[PDB]
Amino acid sequence: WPQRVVTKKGRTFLYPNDLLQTNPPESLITALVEEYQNPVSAKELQADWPDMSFDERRHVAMNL
């Protein structure tokens, strides 16, 4: 506490602190821009994040 997390898909963020922010973990932004090659989804993730619940925030970070 706080423990660095490595998700299956090889993303990194500091749990839980990186999920308690208005912005999503920077690892998820990069993944969506470069790997998924879809920058509009990354900017669309930024818009949903503040209104998301913690459970959804965790779920998204784990599987993205």
């Epitope: 949903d48 209104d51 998301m52 619940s53 459970d55 959804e56 779920h59």
Partner: nanobody
Framework: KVQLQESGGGLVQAGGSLRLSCAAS????????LGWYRRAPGKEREFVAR???????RYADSVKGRFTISRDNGKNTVYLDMNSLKPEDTAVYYC????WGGGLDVYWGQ
Amino acid sequence: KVQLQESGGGLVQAGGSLRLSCAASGGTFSINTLGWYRRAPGKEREFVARISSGGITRYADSVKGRFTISRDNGKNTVYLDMNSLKPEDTAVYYCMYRNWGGGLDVYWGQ
């Protein structure tokens, strides 16, 4: 693998109050954003209301204050309580199921 069955709706006279409901099945719900889009007779899909997994409502300016969107976790249903309807609100109302996980898929109702 994700079902969206909408109910309610019909024909009402100005000033009335209709209620739309949409039920989801086949995946998660509590950790999902649901909403409603409407397409007027000659127009295109238009945002009406959103509600996030955290329970945060977003409304379009034209329908704000009149329409009210709510969700029922554990029943897998989202409700849109329309009040003081007007002729311009005549449209086909579609359900929305906004799930991320894999990388943002968007699902609609019939």
